[PDB]
């Protein structure tokens, strides 16, 4: 528990992380925001979702660490996907547990690209995954 009084987001999320196994990595732009209020950390993921909406943040848990960015650091990507169905690629991300429902792949089965917008660490993964998968399927 924690009563914040104009504390930097970095200090705040460090406080949240005390009761977590994973470190929290707060971007430069997120860290310059301040936060005030009475906080209880009885449900960190729910809090993260709410604060991301209140304060204009985006976040990703990659299974080992939590990344927090300002909404202004959102990466907007267009990604080629020529040799695999969008649905196959989606399921692949999901099964692997890297997919984040807050940052969905936006495409259609007619065209050879899809869009994705979200935390840089996430989008970088999505782009790499699509690039690896497209190549490995580039054949009869």
Residue numbers in the entry: 34 to 173
Describing publication, verbatim:
The bacterial injectisome, or type III secretion system (T3SS), is a specialized syringe-shaped protein-export system utilized by many pathogenic Gram-negative bacteria for the injection of virulence proteins (effectors) into host cells. In summary, we report the crystal structures for the cytoplasmic and periplasmic domains of PrgH and InvG, two of the main basal body components of the prototypical Salmonella SPI-1 injectisome.
Superposition of the InvG and EscC crystal structures revealed a similar organization, with the N0 and N1 domains common to the secretin family; however, the relative orientation of these domains is shifted 36 degrees between the two proteins. Similarly, a dimer formed by a unit cell translation from the InvG crystal lattice superposes with a dimer from the modelled 15-mer ring. Collectively, the crystallographic packing interfaces we observe support and mirror the low energy interfaces generated in our modelled basal body. This would be consistent with a model whereby the soluble domains have low-affinity interaction surfaces for oligomerization, which can be captured by the high concentration in the crystallization experiment. Finally, for InvG we observed a loop (residues 95–99) forming a series of side-chain contacts with the adjacent subunit. Mutation to alanine of the strictly conserved Asp95 within the loop (which lacks any direct interactions with the neighbouring protomer) has no effect on secretion. Furthermore, we observed a positively charged interior collar of the InvG ring corresponding to the N0 domain, where residues are proposed to be in contact with the inner rod and socket. This surface is formed by a set of basic residues lying on one side of the InvG monomer.
